[PDB]
C-alpha cells in the first residue's frame, strides 16, 4: 500500500529538480566548507607574502592578480585584525554608512569577506544589500532572443521590453553567424522602446569585441572570469588576458562588466576542494583587481549547482552582497532556470528583488522561455503580470511597470517598421509588411513567418567582413523616414565618446542623462531614507490591469 499523500507529493514539480548531498572533497558545497582557508595576509616591503593560508611561493595566477591588484594593502592588516562578526553587523546596521564600510571591505582578503557575510542570515544580507548597492536607483536587465534569430521579432520584443522598464537588454544567437543582425535589431528596437537602453550581444570573446568595435553594441557583459586556475584555463583566459580585454573595451569607449557565478568551477571539474562562495569571492576580487566597474554574478548559468546543495540560494545572495560590498556594480543573475517549481523560483528571486540591486535580474526573459537562448530564465514574459502585482503588493520598485496593450502594439510596430527601413536601406534581405505585422502581435517565434536563413547569414557576415558600421544604420534610418530613431541611435553612439557611462553602475535615462553610482549615490540610512518607491513612480506601479474603481 502506498500513501496517497506521498503519491500526490511525488508528483510535485519541485521533485524533478536536481538535489545532491554535499561533496566536500569536490567543492560541491555552497558555502561554509571546512576546507575553506582561514583568512590571513602577510606583507613584506609592500608585497604580499601570504594570502589566506597560501605562501606566495604557491600562488597561482589568480592569487598573484588578487594579491598585487585586488586588495588595499595599506589597510589590509588593520582590517584583518577586526572582528568579522562586528563587520557583518556593520553591513546590516542601517546607521553605518556605505562610505564607512567600503574602505574596510576593499581592504579585506577574499576569505575575510566570505567569513564576514557567512555570519549572516538572508534577512540580514538583504538589509545589507539595499545599503551596499552602488546605484541609489535599482534597475533591471532582460534577455531578448528567439529560436530563429528572427530580427523582426527581436526588434519588437526589444521595444516592448524597453517600454516595460528594462534599462539593459541582452541578445545572443541560435546560429552564430546571425550575430550582426541580432545586435542591430536589438539596438534599434531598444531605442524605439526607450532611447538610452543599453544593448549587448553575447558571443565568443574575440567575436564580441570586434562586434563592439563595429558599433553594433552598447556594452559587453559575458566577459568571463573563473575562480580556480585550471577552470580559468579551460575558459581560455587568464586574469591578465581578461584584464587586457576590459581595458580594450574601455579604449573603444564601451561599458563592460565581467561575469562569474557560484558553482562554475564545480561544473567545470576543478574546485580545488573549496566551497562555491569562496571560489566566487576570488572571481569578485579578480574583477576588482582588473579595475572592471561591475560584475554579473549570483551563480548565473550554473545555478543548478548551488541550488542542489544546502544554503545554496543564501550563498547566491551572499555573493551578490560581497560584489556590492566591494564597491562593484552587481548585475544579480535571476536570469537562469534552476527549478520546475514557481514557489521555489520565487523565493530565489525575492532575495535580490526585495532589497534591490543595480540590476535585480541580469536577464529576465522578455520572451517566453521557449525562445530563450540561454536555456531559460528564472522569469519570463508570461510572468510580467505577476511581477507587477508583487511590486504593488509589497510597495517594492522592481524596475518594471504595467503597460497598455495598445501602447505595446504601437511600439512593437514602430520597431518592426524602423528595422524594415534599416534592412531596405542597407540592402539586407527584405522585411515584409507581413513580417512587420506578425512581429507586432507576436508572443514568440511561433507567431512569426519563417525567414530565408541562408540569405540572412550571408548578408550578416558581409556586415562583419566588409566592416559595415553603426553609422550605416543611422543613415538608413534617417533616409528611410525614421529621423527621430536615427537621432536616438546617433545619441547612443555619442555616449561612447565621453566615457561617462563607463563608470560603476552606469545606465542612461531620461533624455540621454547618464545615471551611475558617481552621480546617483546610494545614501541609505534606514527607514524613510535612501531610495523609496513613492510619488509618480508608485502611481505607475500601482496601476495594474484588473484593478477596477470600487465606485
Amino acid at each position: 500500500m502506498r500513501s496517497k499523500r506521498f503519491e500526490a507529493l511525488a508528483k510535485r514539480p519541485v521533485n524533478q529538480d536536481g538535489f545532491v548531498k554535499e561533496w566536500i572533497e569536490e567543492g560541491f558545497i555552497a558555502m561554509e566548507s571546512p576546507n575553506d582557508p582561514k583568512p590571513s595576509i602577510k606583507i613584506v616591503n609592500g608585497a604580499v607574502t601570504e594570502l589566506d593560508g597560501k605562501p606566495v611561493s604557491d600562488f597561482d595566477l589568480i592569487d598573484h592578480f588578487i594579491a598585487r591588484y585586488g586588495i588595499n594593502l595599506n589597510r589590509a592588516e588593520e582590517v584583518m585584525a577586526m572582528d568579522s562578526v562586528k563587520l557583518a553587523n556593520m553591513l546590516c546596521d542601517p546607521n553605518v554608512k556605505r562610505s564607512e564600510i567600503v574602505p574596510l571591505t576593499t581592504a579585506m582578503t577574499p576569505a575575510k569577506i566570505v567569513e564576514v557575510v557567512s555570519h549572516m542570515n538572508v534577512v540580514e544580507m538583504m538589509m545589507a544589500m539595499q545599503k551596499m548597492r552602488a546605484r541609489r536607483t535599482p534597475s533591471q536587465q532582460a534577455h531578448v532572443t528567439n529560436v530563429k534569430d528572427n530580427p523582426v521579432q527581436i526588434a519588437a520584443d526589444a521595444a516592448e521590453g524597453a517600454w516595460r522598464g528594462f534599462d539593459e537588454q541582452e541578445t545572443t544567437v541560435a546560429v552564430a553567424r546571425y550575430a550582426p543582425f541580432n545586435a542591430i535589431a536589438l539596438l534599434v528596437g531598444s531605442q524605439v522602446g526607450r532611447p538610452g537602453v543599453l544593448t549587448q550581444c553575447s558571443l565568443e570573446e574575440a567575436t564580441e569585441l570586434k562586434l563592439g568595435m563595429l558599433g553594433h553594441t552598447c556594452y559587453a557583459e559575458t566577459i568571463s572570469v573563473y575562480g580556480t586556475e585550471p577552470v580559468f584555463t579551460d575558459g581560455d583566459d587568464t586574469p591578465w588576458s581578461k584584464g587586457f580585454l576590459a581595458s580594450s573595451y574601455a579604449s573603444r569607449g564601451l561599458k563592460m562588466r565581467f561575469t562569474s557565478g557560484s558553482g562554475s568551477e564545480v561544473q567545470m571539474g576543478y574546485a580545488e576542494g573549496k566551497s562555491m562562495l569562496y571560489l566566487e569571492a576570488r572571481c569578485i576580487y579578480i574583477t576588482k583587481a582588473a579595475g572592471v566597474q561591475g560584475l554579473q554574478n549570483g551563480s548565473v548559468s550554473c545555478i543548478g549547482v548551488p541550488s542542489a546543495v544546502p544554503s545554496g540560494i543564501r550563498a547566491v545572495l551572499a555573493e551578490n552582497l560581497i560584489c556590492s560590498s566591494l564597491d562593484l556594480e552587481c548585475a544579480s543573475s535571476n536570469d537562469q532556470t534552476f527549478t520546475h517549481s514557481d514557489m521555489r523560483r520565487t523565493a530565489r528571486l525575492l532575495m535580490q528583488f526585495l532589497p534591490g540591486t543595480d540590476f535585480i535580474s541580469s536577464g529576465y526573459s522578455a520572451v517566453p522561455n521557449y525562445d530563450n537562448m540561454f536555456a531559460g530564465s528564472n522569469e519570463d514574459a508570461e510572468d510580467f503580470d505577476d511581477y507587477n502585482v508583487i511590486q504593488r503588493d509589497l510597495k517594492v520598485d522592481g524596475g518594471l511597470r504595467p503597460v497598455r496593450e495598445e501602447d505595446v502594439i504601437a511600439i512593437r510596430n514602430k520597431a518592426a517598421r524602423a528595422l524594415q527601413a534599416v534592412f531596405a536601406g542597407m540592402g539586407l534581405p527584405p522585411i515584409t509588411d507581413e513580417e512587420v505585422e506578425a512581429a507586432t502581435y507576436a508572443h514568440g517565434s511561433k507567431d512569426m513567418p519563417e525567414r530565408n536563413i541562408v540569405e540572412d547569414i550571408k548578408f550578416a557576415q558581409e556586415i562583419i567582413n566588409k566592416n559595415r558600421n553603426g553609422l550605416e544604420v543611422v543613415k538608413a534610418l534617417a533616409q528611410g523616414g525614421f529621423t527621430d530613431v536615427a537621432q536616438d541611435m546617433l545619441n547612443i553612439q555619442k555616449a561612447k565618446l565621453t566615457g561617462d557611462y563607463l563608470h560603476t553602475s552606469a545606465i542612461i535615462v531620461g533624455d540621454g542623462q547618464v545615471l551611475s553610482a558617481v552621480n546617483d549615490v546610494n545614501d541609505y540610512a534606514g527607514p524613510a531614507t535612501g531610495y523609496r518607491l513613492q510619488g509618480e513612480r508608485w502611481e505607475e506601479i500601482k496601476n495594474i490591469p484588473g484593478a477596477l474603481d470600487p465606485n
Binding site: D17, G18, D236, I303, T337, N369, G376
Partner: protein, 178 residues
C-alpha cells in the same frame, strides 16, 4: 572494452576523414551518457553518419583537457580534413574546425540530455559534409528550459569524474573500436 588504444595519433594527410575525439573516460570508467545512452551506440551512430557520407571516421582519446572544446581542438589538429567532433562521456558534443578559436565551433550540442542516437548520426553526417566542404544545414536545435534544472548537477558530477583522467602533456591516443 570496445575501445583499444593503438598508439599516439598522427596527423591526417588527406581531406578524406573526420576525427572523433572522445574524453579521457569515454567507454572506460564511464560507459553511457547522462541519459543512459551507451557510449558504444553513440560512437557507432557517429561513425555511421560519417562513413555514410563517403568519409573516413578516425577515433582518438584526448587527455590534455576534458573540456569538450579542447577535446575537439585536439582532434582538429590531427584531422586531415581539419574537421573534428568532440564528445564528452556525459554526451556533450561539438563539431570543430582547424582554424577556429577553441571556444568557437561549427555546431554545438550544449544540452546533452536532449541528444538521441539519431542526433548523433546526423552529427557525423554533417561533420562529413563539412569535411567535404558542402555547407550542410545545421542539425536542428534542441532546447529545453528544464534541462538544467533536471540535469545540471548530474552533469557537473559526471564531468568531475571524467576530469580525473586528464593528463597534462599527454598526446592523444588513436583508438581501435570493437
Amino acid at each position: 572494452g570496445f575501445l583499444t588504444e593503438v598508439g599516439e595519433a598522427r596527423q591526417g594527410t588527406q581531406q578524406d576523414e573526420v576525427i572523433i575525439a572522445v574524453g579521457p573516460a569515454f567507454g572506460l570508467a564511464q560507459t553511457v551518457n547522462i541519459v543512459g545512452i551507451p557510449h558504444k551506440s553513440i560512437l557507432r551512430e557517429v561513425i555511421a553518419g560519417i562513413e555514410e557520407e563517403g568519409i573516413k571516421a578516425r577515433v582518438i582519446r584526448c587527455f590534455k583537457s576534458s573540456d569538450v572544446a579542447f577535446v575537439a581542438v585536439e582532434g582538429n589538429r590531427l584531422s586531415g580534413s581539419g574537421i573534428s567532433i568532440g564528445i564528452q562521456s556525459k554526451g556533450t558534443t561539438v563539431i570543430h574546425q582547424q582554424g577556429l578559436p577553441p571556444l568557437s565551433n561549427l555546431e554545438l550540442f550544449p544540452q546533452a540530455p536532449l541528444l538521441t542516437l539519431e542526433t548523433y548520426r546526423q552529427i557525423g553526417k554533417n561533420a562529413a559534409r563539412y569535411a567535404k566542404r558542402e555547407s550542410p544545414q545545421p542539425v536542428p536545435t534542441l532546447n529545453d528550459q528544464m534541462a538544467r534544472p533536471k540535469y545540471q548537477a548530474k552533469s557537473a558530477i559526471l564531468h568531475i569524474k571524467e576530469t580525473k583522467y586528464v593528463v597534462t602533456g599527454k598526446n592523444p591516443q588513436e583508438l581501435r573500436v570493437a
